[PDB]
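Structure first, sequence second, as always.
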């Protein structure tokens, strides 16, 4: 995907999220309302350190759910619904009170590029 467009598009992502360098330097000085996305790619979702997740997203992760580029790209288009679906649960609420039926694709590539 267009990692460059992903980077630009990240202007929205960072409203809640951020991206951190391996050493801890706050590269994307965004918010920390959502789990800092650096290294989301391949991660077992709800398990990033120092982040107050919910039961749903954590359980999804615990069920052996890993964030692929595809999954990430899809998620942003239908968060909450994604959880509800894959967890086969009704009460699978998400903190992400935001959706976007675009960006996901390029942003996923950007995240994949960023995990260095
Ligand atoms: C503010 C509201 C936003 C915006 C604009 C975006 N996200 Fe995203 N996000 C947000 C919260 C509060 C949470 C936590 C969910 C929970 O219930 O705990 C999330 C979570 C994610 C995740 C999950 C990652 C993980 O499991 O560790 C992904 C993936 C994710 N959000 C990605 C993402 C992208 C690519 C965005 C770009 C526009 C984006 N979010 C925006 C809150 C918010």
């Amino acid at each position: 995907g267009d990692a460059a467009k992903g980077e630009k598009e990240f202007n929205k992502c960072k409203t809640c999220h951020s991206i951190i360098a391996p050493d801890g330097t706050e590269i994307v000085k965004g918010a920390k309302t959502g789990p800092n996305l650096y290294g989301v790619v391949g991660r077992t979702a709800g398990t990033y350190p120092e982040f107050k997740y919910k039961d749903s997203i954590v359980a999804l992760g615990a069920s052996g759910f890993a964030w692929t580029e595809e999954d990430i790209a899809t998620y942003v288009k239908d968060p909450g619904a994604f959880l509800k679906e894959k967890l086969d649960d009704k009460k699978a609420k998400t903190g992400m009170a935001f959706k976007l039926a675009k960006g996901g694709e390029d942003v996923a590539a950007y995240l994949a590029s960023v995990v260095k």
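Margin note: The chain has one domain: 1-116.
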